[PDB]
Amino acid sequence: KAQQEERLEGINKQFLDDPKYSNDEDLPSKLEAFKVKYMEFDLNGNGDIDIMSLKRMLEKLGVPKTHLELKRLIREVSSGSEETFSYSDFLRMMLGKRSAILRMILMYEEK
Ligand SMILES: [Ca+2]
């Protein structure tokens, strides 16, 4: 919805002021594209990907992980609980070295 998107945009703006990313000339464009994609996931009423949803996706992609294993994984990359993969967690994971820009083709789907 519109509110869900403004929230993510709010987080993007948050990231557009964070120094650890000011050095990326594509950050603005990346954030818009990651926002769109994130909007496609099965999110909870709080706008996050809960661990159960994450487990389902990883199993469907052929890379199964146990509940505990994902908690342990999420805990190390998240700023929130080990039971949620938030949009910001999503961003921190995806962003970084401009060479990581190539990873974005994983989202590409021909129309
Ligand atoms: Ca979390």
Side-chain angles (χ1 to χ4, degrees), residues 43-91:
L43 307 176
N44 66 15
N46 203 289
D48 304 314
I49 299 171
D50 50 44
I51 190 166
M52 292 321 291
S53 175
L54 217 194
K55 181 172 183 275
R56 179 169 174 267
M57 295 194 274
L58 295 179
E59 297 178 337
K60 278 176 169 292
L61 284 180
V63 172
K65 278 295 175 190
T66 72
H67 187 73
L68 176 60
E69 285 174 352
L70 288 179
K71 281 179 172 182
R72 296 206 56 191
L73 260 174
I74 298 175
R75 196 179 181 84
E76 304 316 295
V77 295
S78 178
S79 69
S81 72
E82 55 180 32
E83 281 157 342
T84 54
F85 195 51
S86 78
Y87 176 59
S88 51
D89 294 336
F90 180 73
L91 291 181

mmCIF file of all heavy atoms in Angstrom, residues 43-91:
data_model
loop_
_atom_site.group_PDB
_atom_site.id
_atom_site.type_symbol
_atom_site.label_atom_id
_atom_site.label_comp_id
_atom_site.label_asym_id
_atom_site.label_seq_id
_atom_site.Cartn_x
_atom_site.Cartn_y
_atom_site.Cartn_z
ATOM 1 N N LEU A 43 4.956 -10.003 3.630
ATOM 2 C CA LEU A 43 5.315 -9.258 4.839
ATOM 3 C C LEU A 43 4.275 -9.368 5.949
ATOM 4 O O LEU A 43 3.113 -9.695 5.694
ATOM 5 C CB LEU A 43 5.526 -7.774 4.497
ATOM 6 C CG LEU A 43 6.493 -7.409 3.358
ATOM 7 C CD1 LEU A 43 6.467 -5.904 3.134
ATOM 8 C CD2 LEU A 43 7.903 -7.878 3.685
ATOM 9 N N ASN A 44 4.702 -9.089 7.180
ATOM 10 C CA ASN A 44 3.813 -9.129 8.337
ATOM 11 C C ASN A 44 3.200 -7.742 8.536
ATOM 12 O O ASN A 44 3.615 -6.782 7.890
ATOM 13 C CB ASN A 44 4.576 -9.552 9.605
ATOM 14 C CG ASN A 44 5.623 -8.528 10.045
ATOM 15 O OD1 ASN A 44 5.625 -7.380 9.594
ATOM 16 N ND2 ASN A 44 6.508 -8.944 10.953
ATOM 17 N N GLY A 45 2.220 -7.640 9.429
ATOM 18 C CA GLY A 45 1.568 -6.364 9.671
ATOM 19 C C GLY A 45 2.516 -5.229 10.011
ATOM 20 O O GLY A 45 2.138 -4.060 9.990
ATOM 21 N N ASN A 46 3.757 -5.571 10.316
ATOM 22 C CA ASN A 46 4.751 -4.570 10.671
ATOM 23 C C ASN A 46 5.641 -4.205 9.478
ATOM 24 O O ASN A 46 6.534 -3.361 9.584
ATOM 25 C CB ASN A 46 5.597 -5.107 11.823
ATOM 26 C CG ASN A 46 6.245 -4.012 12.621
ATOM 27 O OD1 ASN A 46 7.176 -3.350 12.153
ATOM 28 N ND2 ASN A 46 5.748 -3.799 13.837
ATOM 29 N N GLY A 47 5.387 -4.851 8.343
ATOM 30 C CA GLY A 47 6.167 -4.588 7.148
ATOM 31 C C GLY A 47 7.481 -5.350 7.069
ATOM 32 O O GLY A 47 8.332 -5.022 6.246
ATOM 33 N N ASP A 48 7.661 -6.357 7.922
ATOM 34 C CA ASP A 48 8.897 -7.149 7.903
ATOM 35 C C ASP A 48 8.657 -8.553 7.371
ATOM 36 O O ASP A 48 7.519 -9.013 7.275
ATOM 37 C CB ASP A 48 9.499 -7.320 9.304
ATOM 38 C CG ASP A 48 9.770 -6.014 10.001
ATOM 39 O OD1 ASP A 48 10.339 -5.099 9.374
ATOM 40 O OD2 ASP A 48 9.422 -5.913 11.195
ATOM 41 N N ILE A 49 9.743 -9.235 7.031
ATOM 42 C CA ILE A 49 9.641 -10.617 6.581
ATOM 43 C C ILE A 49 9.869 -11.437 7.849
ATOM 44 O O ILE A 49 10.948 -11.370 8.447
ATOM 45 C CB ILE A 49 10.746 -11.001 5.580
ATOM 46 C CG1 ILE A 49 10.661 -10.141 4.325
ATOM 47 C CG2 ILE A 49 10.605 -12.477 5.205
ATOM 48 C CD1 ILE A 49 11.852 -10.332 3.392
ATOM 49 N N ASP A 50 8.863 -12.184 8.291
ATOM 50 C CA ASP A 50 9.077 -12.988 9.483
ATOM 51 C C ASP A 50 9.882 -14.226 9.109
ATOM 52 O O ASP A 50 9.968 -14.604 7.941
ATOM 53 C CB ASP A 50 7.754 -13.372 10.168
ATOM 54 C CG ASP A 50 6.743 -13.969 9.219
ATOM 55 O OD1 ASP A 50 7.116 -14.827 8.386
ATOM 56 O OD2 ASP A 50 5.558 -13.587 9.326
ATOM 57 N N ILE A 51 10.489 -14.840 10.115
ATOM 58 C CA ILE A 51 11.312 -16.011 9.911
ATOM 59 C C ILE A 51 10.601 -17.157 9.172
ATOM 60 O O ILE A 51 11.223 -17.845 8.361
ATOM 61 C CB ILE A 51 11.864 -16.493 11.274
ATOM 62 C CG1 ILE A 51 12.926 -17.572 11.054
ATOM 63 C CG2 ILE A 51 10.711 -16.986 12.162
ATOM 64 C CD1 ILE A 51 13.748 -17.863 12.289
ATOM 65 N N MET A 52 9.308 -17.353 9.430
ATOM 66 C CA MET A 52 8.564 -18.427 8.768
ATOM 67 C C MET A 52 8.454 -18.197 7.267
ATOM 68 O O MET A 52 8.495 -19.141 6.482
ATOM 69 C CB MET A 52 7.152 -18.572 9.353
ATOM 70 C CG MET A 52 7.103 -19.076 10.789
ATOM 71 S SD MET A 52 8.323 -20.376 11.130
ATOM 72 C CE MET A 52 7.688 -21.741 10.169
ATOM 73 N N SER A 53 8.288 -16.938 6.880
ATOM 74 C CA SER A 53 8.179 -16.572 5.478
ATOM 75 C C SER A 53 9.542 -16.758 4.813
ATOM 76 O O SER A 53 9.641 -17.237 3.678
ATOM 77 C CB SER A 53 7.719 -15.115 5.353
ATOM 78 O OG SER A 53 7.704 -14.700 3.993
ATOM 79 N N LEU A 54 10.592 -16.376 5.526
ATOM 80 C CA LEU A 54 11.948 -16.509 5.008
ATOM 81 C C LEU A 54 12.294 -17.992 4.778
ATOM 82 O O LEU A 54 12.885 -18.361 3.760
ATOM 83 C CB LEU A 54 12.938 -15.897 6.001
ATOM 84 C CG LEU A 54 14.149 -15.153 5.439
ATOM 85 C CD1 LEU A 54 15.155 -14.938 6.559
ATOM 86 C CD2 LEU A 54 14.778 -15.944 4.303
ATOM 87 N N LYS A 55 11.917 -18.831 5.742
ATOM 88 C CA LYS A 55 12.172 -20.274 5.686
ATOM 89 C C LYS A 55 11.481 -20.877 4.475
ATOM 90 O O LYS A 55 12.048 -21.708 3.763
ATOM 91 C CB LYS A 55 11.653 -20.951 6.973
ATOM 92 C CG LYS A 55 11.877 -22.472 7.075
ATOM 93 C CD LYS A 55 11.499 -22.970 8.476
ATOM 94 C CE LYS A 55 11.769 -24.461 8.691
ATOM 95 N NZ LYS A 55 10.660 -25.345 8.215
ATOM 96 N N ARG A 56 10.243 -20.452 4.252
ATOM 97 C CA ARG A 56 9.455 -20.946 3.135
ATOM 98 C C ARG A 56 10.161 -20.630 1.815
ATOM 99 O O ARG A 56 10.350 -21.518 0.985
ATOM 100 C CB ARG A 56 8.057 -20.317 3.177
ATOM 101 C CG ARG A 56 7.138 -20.731 2.033
ATOM 102 C CD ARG A 56 5.691 -20.299 2.286
ATOM 103 N NE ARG A 56 4.856 -20.581 1.125
ATOM 104 C CZ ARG A 56 4.607 -19.717 0.145
ATOM 105 N NH1 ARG A 56 5.117 -18.493 0.181
ATOM 106 N NH2 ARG A 56 3.872 -20.090 -0.896
ATOM 107 N N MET A 57 10.564 -19.371 1.632
ATOM 108 C CA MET A 57 11.250 -18.946 0.411
ATOM 109 C C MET A 57 12.543 -19.716 0.175
ATOM 110 O O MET A 57 12.780 -20.214 -0.922
ATOM 111 C CB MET A 57 11.570 -17.443 0.450
ATOM 112 C CG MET A 57 10.344 -16.533 0.450
ATOM 113 S SD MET A 57 10.725 -14.784 0.088
ATOM 114 C CE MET A 57 11.135 -14.149 1.710
ATOM 115 N N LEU A 58 13.384 -19.804 1.201
ATOM 116 C CA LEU A 58 14.653 -20.508 1.076
ATOM 117 C C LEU A 58 14.442 -21.982 0.744
ATOM 118 O O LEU A 58 15.238 -22.587 0.020
ATOM 119 C CB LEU A 58 15.465 -20.353 2.363
ATOM 120 C CG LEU A 58 15.905 -18.914 2.675
ATOM 121 C CD1 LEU A 58 16.678 -18.878 3.987
ATOM 122 C CD2 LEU A 58 16.768 -18.372 1.536
ATOM 123 N N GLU A 59 13.367 -22.570 1.261
ATOM 124 C CA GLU A 59 13.095 -23.971 0.960
ATOM 125 C C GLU A 59 12.624 -24.080 -0.483
ATOM 126 O O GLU A 59 12.957 -25.037 -1.185
ATOM 127 C CB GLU A 59 12.022 -24.545 1.896
ATOM 128 C CG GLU A 59 12.431 -24.567 3.359
ATOM 129 C CD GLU A 59 11.340 -25.096 4.283
ATOM 130 O OE1 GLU A 59 10.151 -25.045 3.907
ATOM 131 O OE2 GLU A 59 11.681 -25.544 5.395
ATOM 132 N N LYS A 60 11.845 -23.100 -0.929
ATOM 133 C CA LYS A 60 11.347 -23.129 -2.298
ATOM 134 C C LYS A 60 12.440 -22.863 -3.321
ATOM 135 O O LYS A 60 12.313 -23.248 -4.476
ATOM 136 C CB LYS A 60 10.199 -22.137 -2.466
ATOM 137 C CG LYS A 60 8.863 -22.688 -1.983
ATOM 138 C CD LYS A 60 7.758 -21.652 -2.057
ATOM 139 C CE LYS A 60 6.406 -22.297 -1.841
ATOM 140 N NZ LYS A 60 6.052 -23.188 -2.975
ATOM 141 N N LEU A 61 13.515 -22.214 -2.885
ATOM 142 C CA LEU A 61 14.634 -21.914 -3.762
ATOM 143 C C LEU A 61 15.623 -23.076 -3.766
ATOM 144 O O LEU A 61 16.654 -23.026 -4.442
ATOM 145 C CB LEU A 61 15.341 -20.635 -3.309
ATOM 146 C CG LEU A 61 14.645 -19.303 -3.620
ATOM 147 C CD1 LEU A 61 15.476 -18.141 -3.091
ATOM 148 C CD2 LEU A 61 14.456 -19.174 -5.126
ATOM 149 N N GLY A 62 15.312 -24.121 -3.004
ATOM 150 C CA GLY A 62 16.193 -25.271 -2.953
ATOM 151 C C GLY A 62 17.356 -25.136 -1.989
ATOM 152 O O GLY A 62 18.336 -25.857 -2.114
ATOM 153 N N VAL A 63 17.257 -24.211 -1.038
ATOM 154 C CA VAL A 63 18.305 -24.020 -0.033
ATOM 155 C C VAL A 63 17.658 -24.043 1.358
ATOM 156 O O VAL A 63 17.568 -23.025 2.036
ATOM 157 C CB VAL A 63 19.047 -22.674 -0.248
ATOM 158 C CG1 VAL A 63 19.990 -22.403 0.911
ATOM 159 C CG2 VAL A 63 19.836 -22.719 -1.555
ATOM 160 N N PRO A 64 17.190 -25.219 1.799
ATOM 161 C CA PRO A 64 16.547 -25.344 3.110
ATOM 162 C C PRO A 64 17.430 -25.021 4.315
ATOM 163 O O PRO A 64 18.603 -25.377 4.343
ATOM 164 C CB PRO A 64 16.061 -26.791 3.117
ATOM 165 C CG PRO A 64 17.102 -27.489 2.314
ATOM 166 C CD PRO A 64 17.291 -26.536 1.144
ATOM 167 N N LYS A 65 16.841 -24.341 5.296
ATOM 168 C CA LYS A 65 17.512 -23.954 6.539
ATOM 169 C C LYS A 65 16.538 -24.129 7.704
ATOM 170 O O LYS A 65 15.361 -23.796 7.578
ATOM 171 C CB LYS A 65 17.965 -22.489 6.466
ATOM 172 C CG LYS A 65 19.278 -22.288 5.723
ATOM 173 C CD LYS A 65 20.402 -22.972 6.485
ATOM 174 C CE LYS A 65 21.706 -22.898 5.740
ATOM 175 N NZ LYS A 65 22.730 -23.772 6.375
ATOM 176 N N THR A 66 17.016 -24.645 8.835
ATOM 177 C CA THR A 66 16.130 -24.851 9.980
ATOM 178 C C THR A 66 15.758 -23.534 10.660
ATOM 179 O O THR A 66 16.410 -22.513 10.464
ATOM 180 C CB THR A 66 16.761 -25.766 11.050
ATOM 181 O OG1 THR A 66 17.801 -25.056 11.730
ATOM 182 C CG2 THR A 66 17.333 -27.039 10.412
ATOM 183 N N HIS A 67 14.696 -23.579 11.458
ATOM 184 C CA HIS A 67 14.212 -22.420 12.194
ATOM 185 C C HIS A 67 15.382 -21.804 12.949
ATOM 186 O O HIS A 67 15.694 -20.621 12.783
ATOM 187 C CB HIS A 67 13.121 -22.866 13.178
ATOM 188 C CG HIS A 67 12.424 -21.742 13.874
ATOM 189 N ND1 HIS A 67 11.523 -20.915 13.238
ATOM 190 C CD2 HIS A 67 12.487 -21.311 15.156
ATOM 191 C CE1 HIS A 67 11.061 -20.025 14.098
ATOM 192 N NE2 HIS A 67 11.631 -20.244 15.269
ATOM 193 N N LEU A 68 16.037 -22.620 13.769
ATOM 194 C CA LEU A 68 17.178 -22.174 14.562
ATOM 195 C C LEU A 68 18.300 -21.603 13.702
ATOM 196 O O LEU A 68 18.881 -20.555 14.028
ATOM 197 C CB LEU A 68 17.724 -23.329 15.392
ATOM 198 C CG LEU A 68 18.986 -23.043 16.207
ATOM 199 C CD1 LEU A 68 18.731 -21.906 17.193
ATOM 200 C CD2 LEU A 68 19.386 -24.304 16.945
ATOM 201 N N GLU A 69 18.614 -22.297 12.615
ATOM 202 C CA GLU A 69 19.666 -21.847 11.711
ATOM 203 C C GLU A 69 19.394 -20.448 11.171
ATOM 204 O O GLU A 69 20.312 -19.644 11.038
ATOM 205 C CB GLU A 69 19.819 -22.830 10.548
ATOM 206 C CG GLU A 69 20.527 -24.112 10.936
ATOM 207 C CD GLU A 69 20.549 -25.146 9.820
ATOM 208 O OE1 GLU A 69 19.881 -24.935 8.780
ATOM 209 O OE2 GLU A 69 21.230 -26.175 9.995
ATOM 210 N N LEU A 70 18.133 -20.159 10.863
ATOM 211 C CA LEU A 70 17.760 -18.846 10.343
ATOM 212 C C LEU A 70 17.772 -17.776 11.425
ATOM 213 O O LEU A 70 18.029 -16.607 11.145
ATOM 214 C CB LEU A 70 16.377 -18.894 9.686
ATOM 215 C CG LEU A 70 16.325 -19.624 8.342
ATOM 216 C CD1 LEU A 70 14.897 -19.620 7.804
ATOM 217 C CD2 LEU A 70 17.281 -18.945 7.358
ATOM 218 N N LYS A 71 17.465 -18.170 12.655
ATOM 219 C CA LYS A 71 17.491 -17.218 13.755
ATOM 220 C C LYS A 71 18.938 -16.776 13.878
ATOM 221 O O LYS A 71 19.243 -15.582 13.911
ATOM 222 C CB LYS A 71 17.060 -17.881 15.059
ATOM 223 C CG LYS A 71 15.568 -18.058 15.219
ATOM 224 C CD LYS A 71 15.284 -18.739 16.534
ATOM 225 C CE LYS A 71 13.807 -18.763 16.836
ATOM 226 N NZ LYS A 71 13.549 -19.389 18.164
ATOM 227 N N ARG A 72 19.826 -17.761 13.930
ATOM 228 C CA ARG A 72 21.247 -17.498 14.044
ATOM 229 C C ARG A 72 21.774 -16.657 12.887
ATOM 230 O O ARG A 72 22.667 -15.833 13.078
ATOM 231 C CB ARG A 72 22.016 -18.818 14.144
ATOM 232 C CG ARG A 72 21.692 -19.613 15.399
ATOM 233 C CD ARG A 72 22.864 -20.496 15.767
ATOM 234 N NE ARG A 72 24.080 -19.701 15.920
ATOM 235 C CZ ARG A 72 25.300 -20.212 16.040
ATOM 236 N NH1 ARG A 72 25.477 -21.525 16.029
ATOM 237 N NH2 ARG A 72 26.347 -19.407 16.157
ATOM 238 N N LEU A 73 21.223 -16.859 11.693
ATOM 239 C CA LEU A 73 21.636 -16.087 10.523
ATOM 240 C C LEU A 73 21.108 -14.658 10.583
ATOM 241 O O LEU A 73 21.851 -13.703 10.358
ATOM 242 C CB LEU A 73 21.115 -16.734 9.249
ATOM 243 C CG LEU A 73 22.092 -17.582 8.441
ATOM 244 C CD1 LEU A 73 21.346 -18.251 7.301
ATOM 245 C CD2 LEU A 73 23.214 -16.694 7.911
ATOM 246 N N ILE A 74 19.815 -14.528 10.865
ATOM 247 C CA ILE A 74 19.157 -13.227 10.955
ATOM 248 C C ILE A 74 19.755 -12.387 12.079
ATOM 249 O O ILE A 74 19.938 -11.185 11.930
ATOM 250 C CB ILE A 74 17.634 -13.376 11.222
ATOM 251 C CG1 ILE A 74 16.967 -14.124 10.067
ATOM 252 C CG2 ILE A 74 16.992 -11.999 11.398
ATOM 253 C CD1 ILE A 74 15.499 -14.419 10.306
ATOM 254 N N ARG A 75 20.061 -13.029 13.200
ATOM 255 C CA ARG A 75 20.625 -12.331 14.349
ATOM 256 C C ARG A 75 21.917 -11.591 13.991
ATOM 257 O O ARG A 75 22.145 -10.472 14.449
ATOM 258 C CB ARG A 75 20.886 -13.328 15.488
ATOM 259 C CG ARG A 75 21.100 -12.682 16.849
ATOM 260 C CD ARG A 75 21.323 -13.713 17.952
ATOM 261 N NE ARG A 75 21.501 -13.064 19.249
ATOM 262 C CZ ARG A 75 20.506 -12.672 20.042
ATOM 263 N NH1 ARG A 75 19.245 -12.874 19.681
ATOM 264 N NH2 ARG A 75 20.773 -12.037 21.182
ATOM 265 N N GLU A 76 22.749 -12.202 13.155
ATOM 266 C CA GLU A 76 24.022 -11.595 12.768
ATOM 267 C C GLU A 76 23.953 -10.470 11.742
ATOM 268 O O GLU A 76 24.888 -9.680 11.628
ATOM 269 C CB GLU A 76 24.980 -12.671 12.257
ATOM 270 C CG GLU A 76 25.217 -13.782 13.259
ATOM 271 C CD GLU A 76 25.429 -13.249 14.666
ATOM 272 O OE1 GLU A 76 26.444 -12.552 14.896
ATOM 273 O OE2 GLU A 76 24.572 -13.522 15.536
ATOM 274 N N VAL A 77 22.862 -10.391 10.991
ATOM 275 C CA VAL A 77 22.741 -9.343 9.982
ATOM 276 C C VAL A 77 21.630 -8.359 10.288
ATOM 277 O O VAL A 77 21.494 -7.341 9.616
ATOM 278 C CB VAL A 77 22.489 -9.942 8.583
ATOM 279 C CG1 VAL A 77 23.699 -10.762 8.144
ATOM 280 C CG2 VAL A 77 21.239 -10.811 8.608
ATOM 281 N N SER A 78 20.842 -8.654 11.310
ATOM 282 C CA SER A 78 19.734 -7.784 11.671
ATOM 283 C C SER A 78 20.037 -6.810 12.805
ATOM 284 O O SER A 78 20.936 -7.031 13.616
ATOM 285 C CB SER A 78 18.521 -8.630 12.042
ATOM 286 O OG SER A 78 17.445 -7.817 12.449
ATOM 287 N N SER A 79 19.283 -5.717 12.839
ATOM 288 C CA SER A 79 19.433 -4.714 13.883
ATOM 289 C C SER A 79 18.231 -4.894 14.795
ATOM 290 O O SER A 79 18.120 -4.255 15.840
ATOM 291 C CB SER A 79 19.422 -3.303 13.287
ATOM 292 O OG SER A 79 18.139 -2.974 12.783
ATOM 293 N N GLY A 80 17.325 -5.772 14.369
ATOM 294 C CA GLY A 80 16.128 -6.059 15.134
ATOM 295 C C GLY A 80 16.158 -7.476 15.675
ATOM 296 O O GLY A 80 17.225 -8.063 15.809
ATOM 297 N N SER A 81 14.992 -8.036 15.976
ATOM 298 C CA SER A 81 14.938 -9.386 16.517
ATOM 299 C C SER A 81 15.465 -10.418 15.519
ATOM 300 O O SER A 81 15.596 -10.151 14.325
ATOM 301 C CB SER A 81 13.508 -9.745 16.930
ATOM 302 O OG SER A 81 12.686 -9.959 15.799
ATOM 303 N N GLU A 82 15.777 -11.600 16.030
ATOM 304 C CA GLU A 82 16.294 -12.680 15.204
ATOM 305 C C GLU A 82 15.151 -13.387 14.503
ATOM 306 O O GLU A 82 15.357 -14.379 13.818
ATOM 307 C CB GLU A 82 17.058 -13.675 16.073
ATOM 308 C CG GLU A 82 16.244 -14.201 17.226
ATOM 309 C CD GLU A 82 17.013 -15.189 18.060
ATOM 310 O OE1 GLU A 82 18.250 -15.035 18.167
ATOM 311 O OE2 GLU A 82 16.383 -16.111 18.620
ATOM 312 N N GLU A 83 13.942 -12.873 14.676
ATOM 313 C CA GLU A 83 12.786 -13.486 14.049
ATOM 314 C C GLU A 83 12.241 -12.688 12.882
ATOM 315 O O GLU A 83 11.207 -13.025 12.320
ATOM 316 C CB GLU A 83 11.698 -13.692 15.089
ATOM 317 C CG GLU A 83 11.948 -14.897 15.962
ATOM 318 C CD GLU A 83 11.233 -14.806 17.282
ATOM 319 O OE1 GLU A 83 10.827 -13.680 17.655
ATOM 320 O OE2 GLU A 83 11.088 -15.855 17.946
ATOM 321 N N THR A 84 12.944 -11.631 12.506
ATOM 322 C CA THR A 84 12.482 -10.816 11.400
ATOM 323 C C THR A 84 13.609 -10.324 10.513
ATOM 324 O O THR A 84 14.714 -10.061 10.979
ATOM 325 C CB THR A 84 11.701 -9.587 11.909
ATOM 326 O OG1 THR A 84 12.508 -8.860 12.843
ATOM 327 C CG2 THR A 84 10.405 -10.009 12.584
ATOM 328 N N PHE A 85 13.333 -10.238 9.219
ATOM 329 C CA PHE A 85 14.312 -9.708 8.289
ATOM 330 C C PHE A 85 13.614 -8.454 7.779
ATOM 331 O O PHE A 85 12.735 -8.519 6.918
ATOM 332 C CB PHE A 85 14.597 -10.687 7.146
ATOM 333 C CG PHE A 85 15.830 -10.345 6.365
ATOM 334 C CD1 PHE A 85 17.035 -10.110 7.021
ATOM 335 C CD2 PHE A 85 15.794 -10.245 4.979
ATOM 336 C CE1 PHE A 85 18.185 -9.777 6.313
ATOM 337 C CE2 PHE A 85 16.944 -9.910 4.255
ATOM 338 C CZ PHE A 85 18.142 -9.677 4.926
ATOM 339 N N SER A 86 13.996 -7.316 8.351
ATOM 340 C CA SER A 86 13.404 -6.029 8.012
ATOM 341 C C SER A 86 13.924 -5.455 6.704
ATOM 342 O O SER A 86 14.878 -5.965 6.107
ATOM 343 C CB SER A 86 13.672 -5.016 9.130
ATOM 344 O OG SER A 86 15.007 -4.537 9.043
ATOM 345 N N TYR A 87 13.290 -4.377 6.263
ATOM 346 C CA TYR A 87 13.709 -3.733 5.031
ATOM 347 C C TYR A 87 15.130 -3.182 5.189
ATOM 348 O O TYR A 87 15.952 -3.306 4.281
ATOM 349 C CB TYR A 87 12.751 -2.607 4.661
ATOM 350 C CG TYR A 87 13.195 -1.844 3.435
ATOM 351 C CD1 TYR A 87 13.363 -2.493 2.210
ATOM 352 C CD2 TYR A 87 13.462 -0.478 3.502
ATOM 353 C CE1 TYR A 87 13.787 -1.797 1.073
ATOM 354 C CE2 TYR A 87 13.887 0.229 2.375
ATOM 355 C CZ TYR A 87 14.046 -0.437 1.166
ATOM 356 O OH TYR A 87 14.459 0.255 0.053
ATOM 357 N N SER A 88 15.428 -2.582 6.340
ATOM 358 C CA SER A 88 16.768 -2.046 6.543
ATOM 359 C C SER A 88 17.793 -3.183 6.568
ATOM 360 O O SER A 88 18.881 -3.040 5.995
ATOM 361 C CB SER A 88 16.839 -1.187 7.820
ATOM 362 O OG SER A 88 16.314 -1.867 8.941
ATOM 363 N N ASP A 89 17.450 -4.307 7.206
ATOM 364 C CA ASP A 89 18.349 -5.468 7.234
ATOM 365 C C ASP A 89 18.575 -5.865 5.778
ATOM 366 O O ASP A 89 19.692 -6.162 5.358
ATOM 367 C CB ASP A 89 17.711 -6.669 7.957
ATOM 368 C CG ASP A 89 17.489 -6.429 9.440
ATOM 369 O OD1 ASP A 89 18.190 -5.584 10.043
ATOM 370 O OD2 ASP A 89 16.604 -7.107 10.006
ATOM 371 N N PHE A 90 17.481 -5.890 5.022
ATOM 372 C CA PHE A 90 17.510 -6.240 3.606
ATOM 373 C C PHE A 90 18.493 -5.308 2.893
ATOM 374 O O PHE A 90 19.344 -5.764 2.134
ATOM 375 C CB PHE A 90 16.096 -6.090 3.031
ATOM 376 C CG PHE A 90 15.972 -6.418 1.566
ATOM 377 C CD1 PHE A 90 16.029 -7.739 1.122
ATOM 378 C CD2 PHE A 90 15.733 -5.405 0.636
ATOM 379 C CE1 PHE A 90 15.843 -8.045 -0.224
ATOM 380 C CE2 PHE A 90 15.546 -5.700 -0.714
ATOM 381 C CZ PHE A 90 15.599 -7.017 -1.147
ATOM 382 N N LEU A 91 18.387 -4.007 3.159
ATOM 383 C CA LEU A 91 19.274 -3.040 2.527
ATOM 384 C C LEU A 91 20.737 -3.248 2.906
ATOM 385 O O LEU A 91 21.601 -3.298 2.032
ATOM 386 C CB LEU A 91 18.850 -1.601 2.872
ATOM 387 C CG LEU A 91 17.524 -1.108 2.272
ATOM 388 C CD1 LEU A 91 17.264 0.335 2.693
ATOM 389 C CD2 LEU A 91 17.584 -1.228 0.749
#
